[PDB]
Design a protein around this ligand. Structure first.
Ligand code: SF4
Lengths: 433, 886, 186, 428
C-alpha cells in the first residue's frame, strides 16, 4: 500500500474523531511503535480501572485522565500518527486480551468506559457527525418535546451518571442531543420505557445505547480474534510482547539505616517479609536475596554499603561469604561479568517467580500469605475491619497489586514496583517533615 | 470377485440420467466384511461351511480353511481369549559407508508362549526360550573362543554364522517354527522392520514370508509404499512396538523414549547403554567386546518385552480395539484416526446411515505440583452440549462460520450416545472395583476402565483431524471454544481456592498445591477435582503425577522428584569429566534432600568452596579431570582442528574412532591439553587448569541447575576518525571528552584542532549504521541453552531448533531486531538536540577509564553550543532517521 | 413504574371518565365487604390505611363502592399529617391510578400474539356452545347483536338468499375492510 | 523475522519440489524424508547447509548436508554421502534434489542427482514483433551498460564519465543506457575515513552524502541526450539509498532531481522489457560469491562463469547464495530472507540478457541460450580505464527465420537473442 492510499484510507476511517475500530488497521509499524503504543494505551486502561475500583465520580475520572491523555495517547488532534496510534494500539490490545474471559471482560469494561469518556469529551457538533457515521433531532424538535424527553430520561441519567441533583440533570439534558429512529431498532429499550416514542419513532440516553452496542460488537470481535490467534502464534516477535502485556494485568541509606523504623516504615509488604526473614534466619535463599538486593539497590544502597549490610546480616564465616556471596552481590550491582547494571524487580517479575515454600520469604505476600496472617498484619497496621475486608476482597480476585496500593494509601493518608512504593512513601514523609 | 474387470471400481460421479451419485465406490473388503457382519475387534468367530481341503500350502499356519460366503461367519459372546505366543525381537545394525546401507549383525529372539491377557501379567516373566544369532561384522570368521565363552557368560543360546545370508535363513526358519502371535520390540515399526525387510530383499532368502503368516515365494514387483508392503508382509503377527505413537501415548513421562529411559521410567530400574559400533575394528578379533555387545542386545530384548508387559500395551490396545471395532493392528501401529474412523463407521452403519466414501511458570517449584488430566475434556463437551452432525444447525457453504449449540429441545445423536455409553461402562467398571476383592479381577477392572477413558479421550480425533473421514470444522470450532472456556473456568476456580495454574493446555494442567505433604497435596487435588466436577457434572479429571520438587522449563523439558530420578539432562556425560559429574550429582542430592534448603544450600556452598580450593591446590586425583571424545573423522582433515583439544593431542601423538582422553593443563585452550597418562606422570610437571574446568565444566552446568538509560545499556558507541591526523575517538554528543570538542564553529578534534565539516561527520555516522546493518543481515544465531551456546548463521527449516544434535535450546538471532533497533535509537539520541541540552545522554566513559575527561562542561556551555550547532545536529539526526524510518 | 409512559398516561386519561360510571355504579363489586377486602385493600400501599379501612367497613358494612372510594381519601387524609402528607397523597393517587388500570386496562391473551405459527379462530366461525356468529365488531357492537345459526336458518327458510339476513351487514363491513386492505396493499 | 525467514526457506524447498515433480513427472509418493532410515531408494529436495552450524570457511564434498523442509523432514538436516557421484557441483543456498537412500540412518547417499530444469524463456506474438520492427525502423537496437563505481579511490574526478557521456551522445547514440551503482559507495576510503575535501567548482558545498550525489552526479547525468533512455538500478552500497538489504527498493527519481524525459529509477533486482528483449538485472555480485564444490574432471574443466551462469538460471533467483557472504564489518551481500520471493525470476521467465555486475574481469557470455553480460566497473580504484558494455541487437524479422516459431493454436515466437545480439566490452 502506497502511503497515499494509506493516508486516504485512514482519512476515511477517521472522518469522525472517535471510532468503533470496525476495520482492521492496514500498514506497517516498527515493533517499538507496536510496543510503546500498546503500553501507553494499557496504562490508560489500568488508570481507568484503578479509578473505577475507588468508585470515583465520572467527572473526577475525566479530570484525572485529561493529563495522561495529553501525555500518552493524545486525542482531539488532527495528527495522522496519533490516530494511527489509537487504532493500532487498540487492535494490539484486542490481540492481548482475547485469551481469557476474565481478561476480555476487563478489556470490554475498560474500553467501554474509555469510549464513554471520549464521547463525552467531544463537542456536540462532533458528537453529531460521529452518530451520523441515526438522525439527530433539531433544536426546535428537541424543545417541542423537551418535557417528555426529560421525563423519560431522568431516571436513566440519575442511575447511570449518578447525577443525584435535579439542576445537574437539567444542565446535562440541555446539552444532550437525541436520536430519532424507528422503535423497531430500539425494541429492547422500548420494553423498559427507556426511550420516548411518538408516531412510531423512538427518541433515544443515547450514550448508553452507543456504549452497549460498542461493548457487544467489541465482545464479538474479541471472540473472533481469539479464534484466529492460533494462526498468529507463528511469529516470534509478537508473542513475548503479548504475554507481557497480558500478564502485566497481575549516604542516608547505609548498612545500618535500612533496619531503622524511619526507613523500613516505608517498605511494602514484600520487603518487610524479606527482612523479617533475613533477621530471624540470618540468611535468605537465592530468589529472596536477589529481589531484596535489587530493591535495596533501587532505593539507593551502594555496592559497598550493601556488601557491609550483607556481611553483617549473615551472623556465616567471612571466607564462605567472600568465596560464595560477594561475587553475586557485586554482580547484582553490575561490577562483575558482563557489567550489566541489573534492574530492580517489579511486581510482575516478582510474581512471575515460583511460589515460596518452607523457609522461603520471597515473592509477594498478598499472594503467598493465608488471609489470617494478612488480617493480623493489617490489624497491626491500624487498618479498620472494613479496610481489611476491602484489602482481602481485592486480594481474593487476583488483584494483588491494587490491594498493595490500597494498604499504601490507607496507611499514609497504582503501584506495581516496590521501589515505587518506597519512593512515594519517602516523598510523603519528607513532605510531612 | 468378478470374472471381468475385478480391479475397476465405480466412480461416485458416474454420468447417468436416472441417478446422480454413487456411494461405496471404493469400499474396502475388510471394511464391508466387518460392518456387514457386525464384527467388533478380536472376538471368537463361529464359522460354518468351512472348507478343509480347498487350501493347499498357502500359509505358515498349520490350519487352513475357506468359506464360500461371508454370512457363514458370525460373532460369539465369549469374553475369554486363548494364550498369546509373543516373541521379543531386537536388532543391532551396521551402517555400510559404501552403499549407505544398514546391515544386520545380531538377532536376539526371546519368546513368551503363554502370555495371557485374561490375568495380570506377573512382573519379570522369564521367557520360555532365548536365542541370539550373530554374523561377523567385518570378516568371515569370529574371534577364537567365542562359542564356549558366550556359553560361559551369556544366558540363552547363541548361534554363530559365517555370513548374514545363513543368518537370516535361520532367523526365518526359527520364526516359522516358533509361530508366535505378537512381535514385541522397541522402535520396530519405523526402523527395524524396514531395515530387516530391505536386507532380506538384498540377500534373496527363500523364506522371507515367515515374518508374516501368508506364504509367498516372490517379492512385490514395486518393492512410501515400502510401509504398505512391509505391513502386508508381516500380516497375521501383530507388531507391538513400544516407542510407536501409541506406545508413546501410554508413557507421557518420558522425553526421549529411548530404551533405557523407558525402562527407568516404567520399571524403576537403571540400565546404562553401551554405545555400539560394529564399524570398529576391535569387533573382529576381540571376543569380549563382541560378547558385551550381544549381552547388550539380549538385555535390550528382555527390557523391551518387560516394559511392554508393564505399561499394559497389549491389553490396552485390545480393549481400545474391541471398543472401536477396527483391527487390532490398526490400533497398535497407528494413530487415533483409525479407531475414531471405525467406531463412527459402525455406529452410523448400524443405524441406517450412509457413511462417506473412503504457559509454563519456569523455575524451581518447591510446593507439591500435580499433573491433572484434561483428556476427557472434548468428550465431556460433546456429550454435555449434544454436539453432533444431526443436532447442530450450521452453514455448510462457509465452514469457518461458528455454529450455535443445539437447544435442549433437540434430541441426542449417535456419537454423543457412544460417548455416554463409554462413560457409563467406565462407571459400572468402577462400581465393580469398589466391591472387588480378588486382585486379578481388580487389575482387569483397572485395564478396562483405562481403555474406556482412552477411547473417550481419543474420540476427538474423529472430527478434529483434518484428513479425517468425518471432518467437520464448525463443530470442531464450537467444541474447541467450549473447551477453552472450561479451561479458563478451571483456572479461575483454582485461583478462587488458592492454587496456581503452573502450566496448562487442553490435555493436562499442572497445579501448584502449595503444600509439602503427600496427603495434603492429594487432598487438595481431590478437592479441586470435586470442585470441577461440581461445576461440570461430566468432566471427571484425575491426578496422574505428583511432583514434590519441579525444575520446569516446558511441558517436556524438566527435572523433578516424582512420587509413586532424572530424565532429559544426563545424555552428555562424555564431555564432562568425573569431577564435574560428581559435583553436579552431589549438588542435586543435597538440594533434593530432606534438609532445610538454607542449610542444604550452605552445604552445597561449602562443597563448592572446598572443590575450588582443591582444584586450585590440585590435590584431586588426575583421574577425575579426564575428558573422553571419540574421533568421527581423521585428525588431519578436521575443519577447525585448532579449536578442539583431541586433534591437538592426537596430532602430537602422530585414527578416526579412536578415543582420546585429555586434561586441560596450565596459550589456546585447545593447545594446553595433554595426554591423560602424560598428566599423571608427575615428572612431566603437568597440572590441570583450574580456570577452564572451573568456568566451562563446573560453573556452566550448575548455572542451569541452580537457576532511556536502561534501553541502551547493551548498545555500542560511535567511533569516528579525525580526517587530518587519523585520531579515532568515540562521540557522545555535547559532553566532555579528551579527544573532541564542540566549538562555536562546529565539532573540533583536540589533537590537531581541525574541525569536522558536516559531510565528514555524517559520512562516518552512516558508515557505522551500514556496518551494523551488514552485521545484522549476516544473520548470526546462537543457542539459548547455556551448555551449547554455539554461534551459527545456518537456519534450520524449523527456525527455532538448535542444530546441536538433540539439544533443546531455543535459537535466537544474536543481533536481534531489538538490539539493532535500539542501537539505531541510541544513534539517534546521540544527535537529539533536546536530549543533548538536558544532558540525558548515555555515557561513553567509565570513571576508571584511562580516557575519562579531565574537564567537565557546564550546563550553560552545553546549551549554548547546542543552540549554535543545531543545523549540524539536525543533519546528523536525519542521516540516522533515513534508516530508522526504514 | 413511575413516571408514567406517554402511552400509559394517555390510556389512563382515556379510561378515567369511564371508571366511575362502570365500576362504582354499574358493576358495584366492592359493595360486598369481603370482595372489597379481597380486591381493593391489597392494591393500597399503606398497611395502617388498609387496616383502618378494613375496620371502618366492618363497622359500617355494605357501603357502596363509591362510598368506599370516598372513605379511602377521607381516612387517608385523617391519618397522614405533617410535612410528609404530600408524599402520602401522591402515593394514594398513584395507587388509585394503578387500580383503575388494573380494573379497566386491556387484558390480552399473551400466547396468541408471540409467534408467527400461532392459530387463531377464523372470522364468522360458529361457536359450538352458543351458536353465535363471530362477526366483526363496530363501535355499536354488543354480545346480543351477534346472530345465531338457528336464527339465520329461520330467516333463510322464509327467503332463500343470504343478502336477506342480519348477517349481511357484517359481511358488508367485511367487504369494506377487504376493499380498504386491497387498496392500501396496492 | 525468524519465523518468516524459516517460512521462506521452507517455501524455497517445497516450490522447487513441485517444479521438479512436474518436470520429471514423478508422483509425490516418491518424495520422502531423507534423514530417517528407509529400506528403498527415495526422492528428496532440500537446501545446502554446512554439516556444522559453525564451520570452517572452506568446504568439500565430505562436509555437506541437505536440509529438509517442514513437511518433508520436519526441519532436520541430513549429512551428505557423495562417494558414488563422480560429477557434481553444489553451493550454499542452492535448493537441490536427490534420488538416494538413507539406510545408514546418518548419511544420505545420492545414487543420482536431479538437475533443476531451466525456466522457459519468454515468447512473443507476431503483432508485437512487427510493432518492434516498426519502432526500430530497420536499424538495430543499441543498449549501453555501465556499472560503478565511477570515480577512483584517491580523487573525485568524473572526467572519464564526461568522456563516456560525450561518447554515447555523439558517436554511439544508444537507444537505452542502463547504468548501475555503486554511485556514492559507502565503503570508499576517502568517504569512510572522512577525507572529503572542499570542492572549488561547487558554489555551495555539500553537507551530507545526498548533497554529494546531487552536486556530483546529477549535473553530469543531466547531460545525457534526452533521446537516450536511462535506467538506474541501485546497489546495497549506495549511501544515496535507504534500503540496505537485497532485494532493494527502487531509487526515487524526484529526489535525485533527475529529468522525467529520459530517466527511470528501477528496483534492484529488476526484470523488464526494452522492445522485444527480456532483461534480467540484479546488483549483488553473484559471480564472486558463489563458492562451488566440484567433483569430476569434466565439471572442473568447464568455465566457472558458465557453471555460475547455469546456477543463476536454474535457481530461479538472482542471488541463490545463502547465507549472504560477508566482507570482514565493512559490508556484505546483506540478504533479507523474509522477502526471498521478490528476488525470483519474474513470472518464471529466464531473462534473455542477464546483467550482474561483478568485481571480476568484464565478461559477456551466452550460457543455455541466455546472454549473460558482466561489464565490470566503470573505473578501477587506481583511476585507469575500467569497462562498460555495448549491446547491439539485429532488428527482429519473421521472414529471416532467426526467430523460431512455437507450435500451437496461437502462433507465438521465441526470441533468439543469442543469435541476434552482438556484445562488445569497450574499456570506458
Ligand atoms: S504488591 Fe508488589 S510492592 Fe506490594 S507487597 Fe506485593 S510484591 Fe511487594
Amino acid at each position: 500500500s502506497s502511503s497515499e492510499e494509506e493516508k486516504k484510507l485512514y482519512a476515511r476511517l477517521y472522518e469522525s474523531k472517535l471510532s468503533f475500530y470496525d476495520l482492521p488497521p492496514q500498514g506497517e509499524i516498527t515493533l517499538e511503535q507496536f510496543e510503546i503504543w500498546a503500553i501507553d494505551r494499557l496504562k490508560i486502561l489500568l488508570e481507568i480501572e484503578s479509578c473505577l475500583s475507588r468508585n470515583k465520580s465520572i467527572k473526577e475520572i475525566e479530570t484525572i485522565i485529561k493529563p495522561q491523555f495529553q501525555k500518552l495517547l493524545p486525542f482531539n488532534t488532527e495528527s495522522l500518527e496519533d490516530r494511527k496510534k489509537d487504532y493500532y494500539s487498540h487492535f494490539i490490545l484486542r490481540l492481548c486480551f482475547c485469551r481469557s474471559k476474565e481478561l476480555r471482560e476487563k478489556f470490554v469494561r475498560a474500553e467501554t468506559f474509555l469510549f464513554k469518556i471520549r464521547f463525552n469529551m467531544l463537542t456536540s457538533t462532533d458528537q453529531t457527525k460521529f452518530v451520523q457515521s441515526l438522525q439527530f433531532i433539531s433544536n426546535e424538535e428537541k424543545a417541542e418535546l423537551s418535557h417528555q424527553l426529560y421525563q423519560t430520561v431522568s431516571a436513566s441519567l440519575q442511575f447511570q451518571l449518578n447525577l443525584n441533583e435535579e439542576h445537574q440533570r437539567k444542565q446535562y439534558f440541555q446539552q444532550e442531543k437525541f436520536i430519532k429512529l424507528p422503535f423497531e431498532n430500539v425494541i429492547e429499550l422500548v420494553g423498559n420505557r427507556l426511550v420516548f416514542l411518538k408516531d412510531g419513532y423512538a427518541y433515544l440516553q443515547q450514550l448508553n445505547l452507543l456504549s452497549n452496542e460498542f461493548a457487544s460488537k467489541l465482545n464479538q470481535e474479541l471472540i473472533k480474534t481469539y479464534q484466529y490467534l492460533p494462526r498468529l502464534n507463528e511469529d516470534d516477535r509478537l508473542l513475548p510482547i503479548l504475554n507481557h502485556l497480558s500478564s502485566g494485568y497481575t549516604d542516608e541509606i547505609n548498612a545500618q539505616s535500612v533496619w531503622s523504623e524511619e526507613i523500613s516504615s516505608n517498605y511494602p509488604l514484600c520487603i518487610k517479609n524479606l527482612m523479617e526473614g533475613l533477621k530471624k534466619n540470618h540468611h535468605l535463599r537465592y530468589y529472596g536475596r536477589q529481589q531484596l538486593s535489587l530493591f535495596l539497590k533501587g532505593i539507593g544502597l551502594s555496592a559497598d554499603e550493601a556488601l557491609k549490610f550483607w556481611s553483617e546480616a549473615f551472623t556465616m564465616t567471612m571466607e564462605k561469604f567472600n568465596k560464595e556471596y560477594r561475587y553475586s552481590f557485586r554482580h547484582n550491582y553490575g561490577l562483575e561479568g558482563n557489567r550489566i547494571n541489573y534492574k530492580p524487580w517489579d511486581c510482575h517479575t516478582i510474581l512471575s517467580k515460583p511460589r515460596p515454600g518452607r523457609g522461603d520469604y520471597h515473592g509477594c505476600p498478598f499472594r503467598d500469605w493465608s488471609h489470617e496472617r494478612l488480617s493480623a498484619e493489617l490489624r497491626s497496621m491500624k487498618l479498620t475491619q472494613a479496610q481489611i475486608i476491602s484489602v482481602l476482597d481485592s486480594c481474593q480476585k487476583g488483584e494483588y497489586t491494587i490491594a498493595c496500593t490500597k494498604v499504601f494509601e490507607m496507611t499514609h493518608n497504582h503501584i506495581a514496583h516496590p521501589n515505587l512504593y518506597f519512593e512515594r512513601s519517602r516523598q510523603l514523609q519528607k513532605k510531612q517533615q | 470377485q468378478t470374472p471381468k474387470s475385478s480391479r475397476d471400481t465405480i466412480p461416485s460421479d458416474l454420468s447417468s440420467d436416472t441417478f446422480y451419485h454413487v456411494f461405496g465406490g471404493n469400499s474396502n473388503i475388510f471394511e464391508s466384511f466387518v460392518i456387514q457382519n457386525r464384527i467388533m475387534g478380536p472376538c471368537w468367530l463361529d464359522i460354518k461351511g468351512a472348507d478343509f481341503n480347498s487350501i493347499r500350502n498357502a500359509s505358515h499356519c498349520a490350519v487352513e480353511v475357506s468359506v464360500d460366503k461371508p454370512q457363514n461367519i458370525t460373532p460369539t459372546t465369549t469374553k475369554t481369549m486363548p494364550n498369546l505366543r509373543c516373541l521379543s525381537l531386537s536388532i543391532q545394525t551396521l551402517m555400510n559407508p559404501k552403499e549407505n546401507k544398514q546391515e544386520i549383525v545380531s538377532i536376539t529372539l526371546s519368546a513368551y508362549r503363554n502370555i495371557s491377557l485374561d490375568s495380570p501379567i506377573p512382573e519379570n516373566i522369564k521367557p520360555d526360550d532365548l536365542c541370539t544369532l550373530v554374523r561377523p561384522p567385518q570378516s568371515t570368521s569370529f574371534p577364537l573362543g567365542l562359542a564356549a565363552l558366550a556359553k560361559q557368560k551369556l544366558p540363552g543360546r547363541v548361534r554363530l554364522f559365517n555370513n548374514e545370508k545363513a543368518m537370516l535363513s535361520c532367523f526365518c526358519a526359527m520364526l516359522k517354527v516358533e509361530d508366535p502371535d505378537v512381535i514385541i520390540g522397541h522402535r520396530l515399526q519405523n526402523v527395524y522392520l524396514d531395515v530387516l525387510a530391505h536386507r532380506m530383499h538384498d540377500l534373496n532368502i527363500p523364506t522371507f514370508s515367515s515374518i508374516g503368516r501368508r506364504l509367498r515365494r516372490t517379492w512385490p514387483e514395486k518393492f512410501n509404499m515400502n510401509h504398505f508392503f512391509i505391513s502386508d508382509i508381516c500380516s497375521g503377527r501383530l507388531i507391538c512396538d513400544i516407542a510407536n505413537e501409541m506406545g508413546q501415548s501410554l508413557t507421557p513421562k518420558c522425553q526421549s523414549w529411548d530404551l533405557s529411559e523407558m525402562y527407568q521410567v516404567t520399571c524403576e530400574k537403571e540400565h546404562k547403554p553401551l554405545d555400539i559400533d560394529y564399524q570398529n575394528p576391535q569387533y573382529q578379533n576381540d571376543v569380549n567386546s563382541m560378547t558385551m555387545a550381544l549381552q547388550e542386545n539380549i538385555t535390550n530384548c528382555m527390557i523391551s518385552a518387560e516394559v511392554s508387559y508393564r505399561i499394559q500395551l497389549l491389553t490396552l490396545t485390545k480393549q481400545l480395539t474391541n471398543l472401536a471395532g477396527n483391527a487390532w493392528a490398526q490400533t497398535l501401529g497407528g494413530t487415533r484416526a483409525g479407531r475414531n474412523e471405525y467406531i463412527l463407521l459402525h455406529e452410523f452403519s448400524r443405524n441406517g446411515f450412509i457413511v462417506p466414501d473412503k504457559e509454563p511458570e519456569k523455575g524451581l517449584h518447591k510446593n507439591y505440583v500435580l499433573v491433572m488430566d484434561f483428556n476427557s475434556l472434548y468428550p465431556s463437551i460433546i456429550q454435555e452440549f449434544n454436539i453432533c452432525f444431526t443436532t447442530v444447525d450450521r452453514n455448510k457453504e462457509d465452514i469457518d462460520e461458528l455454529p450455535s449449540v443445539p437447544p435442549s429441545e433437540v434430541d441426542q445423536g449417535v456419537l454423543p450416545r457412544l460417548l455416554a455409553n463409554l462413560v457409563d461402562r467406565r462407571r459400572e467398571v468402577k462400581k465393580v472395583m469398589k466391591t472387588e476383592t480378588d486382585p486379578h479381577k481388580r487389575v482387569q477392572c483397572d485395564i478396562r476402565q483405562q481403555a474406556l477413558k482412552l477411547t473417550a479421550n481419543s474420540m476427538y480425533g474423529c472430527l478434529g483431524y483434518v484428513n479425517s473421514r468425518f471432518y467437520a470444522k464448525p463443530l470442531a470450532m464450537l467444541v474447541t471454544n467450549k473447551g477453552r472456556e472450561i479451561l479458563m473456568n478451571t483456572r479461575q476456580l483454582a485461583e478462587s481456592m488458592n492454587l496456581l495454574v503452573v502450566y496448562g493446555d487442553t490435555d493436562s494442567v499442572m497445579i501448584d498445591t502449595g503444600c509439602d505433604n503427600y496427603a495434603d497435596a492429594i487432598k487438595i487435588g481431590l478437592g479441586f477435582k470435586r470442585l470441577v466436577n461440581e461445576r461440570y457434572r461430566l468432566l471427571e479429571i484425575d491426578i496422574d503425577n505428583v511432583f514434590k520438587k519441579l525444575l520446569l522449563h516446558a511441558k517436556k523439558k524438566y527435572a523433578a522428584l516424582t512420587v509413586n530420578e532424572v530424565k532429559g539432562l544426563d545424555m552428555k556425560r562424555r564431555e564432562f569429566c568425573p569431577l564435574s559429574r560428581d559435583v553436579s550429582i552431589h549438588v542435586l542430592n543435597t538440594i533434593l534432600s530432606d534438609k532445610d534448603p538454607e542449610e542444604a544450600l550452605q552445604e552445597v556452598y561449602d562443597y563448592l568452596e572446598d572443590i575450588r580450593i582443591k582444584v586450585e591446590t590440585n590435590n584431586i586425583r588426575i583421574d577425575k579431570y579426564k575428558i573422553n571424545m571419540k574421533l568421527s573423522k581423521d585428525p588431519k582433515a578436521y575443519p577447525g582442528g585448532k579449536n578442539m583439544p583431541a586433534v591437538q593431542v592426537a596430532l602430537r601423538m602422530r585414527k578416526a574412532g579412536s578415543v582420546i582422553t585429555f586434561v586441560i593443563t596450565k596459550l589456546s585452550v585447545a593447545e594446553r591439553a595433554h595426554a591423560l597418562n602424560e598428566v599423571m606422570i608427575k615428572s612431566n610437571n603437568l597440572i590441570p587448569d583450574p580456570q577452564y574446568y572451573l568456568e566451562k565444566q563446573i560453573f556452566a552446568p550448575v548455572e542451569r541447575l541452580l537457576e532511556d538509560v536502561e534501553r541502551f545499556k547493551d548498545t555500542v558507541t560511535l567511533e569516528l576518525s579525525c580526517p587530518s591526523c587519523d585520531k579515532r575517538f568515540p562521540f557522545g554528543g555535547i559532553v566532555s571528552s579528551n579527544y573532541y570538542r564542540v566549538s562555536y564553529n562546529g565539532l573540533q578534534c583536540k589533537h590537531c584542532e581541525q574541525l569536522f565539516t558536516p559531510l565528514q561527520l555524517t559520512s562516518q555516522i552512516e558508515h557505522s549504521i551500514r556496518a551494523h546493518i551488514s552485521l545484522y543481515y549476516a544473520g548470526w544465531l546462537q543457542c539459548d541453552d547455556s551448555t551449547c551456546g554455539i554461534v551459527t548463521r545456518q537456519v534450520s527449516v524449523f527456525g527455532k531448533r538448535c542444530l546441536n544434535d538433540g539439544c533443546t535450546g531455543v535459537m535466537r538471532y544474536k543481533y536481534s531486531d531489538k538490539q539493532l533497533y535500539n542501537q539505531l535509537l541510541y544513534f539517534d539520541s546521540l544527535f537529539d538536540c533536546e536530549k543533548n541540552k538536558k544532558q540525558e545522554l548515555k555515557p561513553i566513559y567509565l570513571p576508571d577509564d584511562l580516557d575519562y575527561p579531565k574537564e567537565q562542561l557546564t550546563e550553560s556551555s552545553i546549551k549554548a553550543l547546542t543552540e549554535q550547532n543545531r543545523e549540524l545536529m539536525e543533519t546528523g539526526r536525519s542521516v540516522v532517521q533515513k534508516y530508522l524510518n526504514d | 413504574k413511575r413516571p408514567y409512559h406517554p402511552h400509559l398516561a394517555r390510556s389512563l386519561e382515556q379510561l378515567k371518565p369511564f371508571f366511575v360510571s362502570i365500576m362504582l355504579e354499574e358493576q358495584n363489586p366492592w359493595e360486598d365487604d369481603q370482595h372489597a377486602i379481597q380486591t381493593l385493600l391489597p392494591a393500597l400501599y399503606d398497611k395502617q390505611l388498609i387496616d383502618s379501612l378494613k375496620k371502618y367497613w366492618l363497622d359500617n358494612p355494605r357501603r357502596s363502592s363509591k362510598e368506599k372510594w370516598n372513605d379511602i381519601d377521607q381516612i387517608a387524609t385523617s391519618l397522614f399529617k405533617g410535612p410528609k402528607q404530600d408524599s402520602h397523597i401522591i402515593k394514594l393517587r398513584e395507587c388509585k391510578e394503578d387500580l383503575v388500570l388494573m380494573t379497566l386496562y386491556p387484558k390480552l391473551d399473551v400466547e396468541v400474539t408471540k409467534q408467527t405459527i400461532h392459530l387463531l379462530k377464523a372470522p364468522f366461525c360458529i361457536h359450538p356452545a352458543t351458536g353465535n356468529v363471530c362477526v366483526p365488531i363496530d363501535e355499536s357492537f354488543a354480545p346480543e347483536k351477534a346472530p345465531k345459526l338457528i336464527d339465520l336458518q329461520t330467516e333463510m327458510e322464509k327467503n332463500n338468499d343470504v343478502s336477506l339476513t342480519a348477517l349481511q351487514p357484517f359481511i358488508n363491513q367485511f367487504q369494506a375492510y377487504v376493499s380498504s386492505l386491497l387498496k392500501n396493499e396496492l | 523475522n525468524l519465523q518468516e525467514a524459516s517460512d521462506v526457506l521452507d517455501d524455497q524447498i517445497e516450490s522447487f519440489t513441485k517444479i521438479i515433480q512436474n518436470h520429471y513427472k514423478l508422483s509425490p509418493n516418491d518424495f520422502a524424508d531423507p534423514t530417517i532410515q528407509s529400506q528403498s531408494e527415495i526422492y528428496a529436495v532440500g537446501r545446502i547447509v554446512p554439516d556444522s552450524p559453525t564451520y570452517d570457511k572452506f568446504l568439500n564434498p565430505e562436509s555437506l548436508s541437505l536440509e529438509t523442509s517442514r513437511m518433508g523432514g520436519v526441519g532436520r538436516r541430513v549429512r551428505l554421502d557423495l562417494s558414488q557421484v563422480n560429477e557434481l557441483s553444489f553451493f550454499l543456498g542452492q535448493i537441490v534434489a536427490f534420488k538416494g537412500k538413507n539406510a545408514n540412518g546418518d548419511y544420505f547417499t545420492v545414487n543420482s542427482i536431479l538437475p533443476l530444469p531451466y525456466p522457459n524463456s519468454p515468447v512473443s506474438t507476431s503483432q508485437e514483433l512487427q510493432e518492434f520492427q516498426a519502432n526500430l525502423e530497420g536499424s538495430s537496437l543499441k543498449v549501453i551498460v555501465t556499472c560503478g563505481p565511477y570515480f577512483a579511490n584517491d580523487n573525485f574526478s568524473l572526467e572519464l564519465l564526461q568522456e563516456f557521456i560525450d561518447s554515447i551522445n555523439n558517436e554511439v547514440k544508444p537507444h537505452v543506457l542502463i547504468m548501475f551503482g555503486p554511485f556514492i559507495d559507502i565503503t570508499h576510503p576517502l568517504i569512510a575515513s572522512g577525507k572529503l575535501p572542499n570542492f572549488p567548482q561547487f558554489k555551495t558545498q555539500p553537507k551530507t552524502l545526498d548533497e554529494l550525489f546531487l552536486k556530483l552526479f546529477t549535473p553530469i547525468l543531466k547531460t545525457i541526450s534526452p533521446h537516450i533512455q536511462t535506467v538506474l538500478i541501485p546497489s546495497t552500497k549506495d549511501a544515496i539509498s535507504n534500503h540496505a538489504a537485497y532485494p532493494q527498493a527502487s531509487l526515487i527519481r524526484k529526489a535525485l532531481q533527475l529529468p522525467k524525459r529520459n530517466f527511470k529509477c528501477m528496483a534492484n533486482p529488476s526484470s523488464f522489457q526494452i522492445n522485444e528483449i527480456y532483461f534480467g538485472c540484479s546488483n549483488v555480485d553473484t559471480f564472486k560469491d558463489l563458492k562451488e564444490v566440484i567433483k569430476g574432471g569434466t565439471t572442473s574443466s568447464r568455465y566457472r562463469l558458465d557453471r555460475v551462469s547455469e546456477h543463476i538460471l536454474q535457481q530461479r533467483r538472482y542471488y541463490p547464495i545463502f547465507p549472504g557472504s560477508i566482507r570482514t564489518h565493512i559490508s556484505g551481500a546483506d540478504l533479507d530472507v523474509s522477502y526471498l520471493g521478490l528476488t525470483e525470476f519474474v513470472g518464471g521467465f529466464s531473462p534473455d540478457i542477464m546483467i550482474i555486475p561483478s568485481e571480476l574481469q568484464h565478461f559477456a557470455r551466452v550460457v543455455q541460450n541466455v546472454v549473460v553480460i558482466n561489464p565490470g566497473r566503470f573505473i578501477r580504484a587506481t583511476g585507469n580505464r575500467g569497462s562498460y558494455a555495448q549491446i547491439t541487437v539485429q532488428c527482429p524479422d519473421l521472414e529471416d527465420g532467426k526467430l523460431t516459431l512455437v507450435e500451437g493454436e496461437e502462433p507465438v515466437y521465441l526470441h533468439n537473442v543469442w543469435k541476434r545480439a552482438r556484445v562488445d566490452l569497450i574499456a570506458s
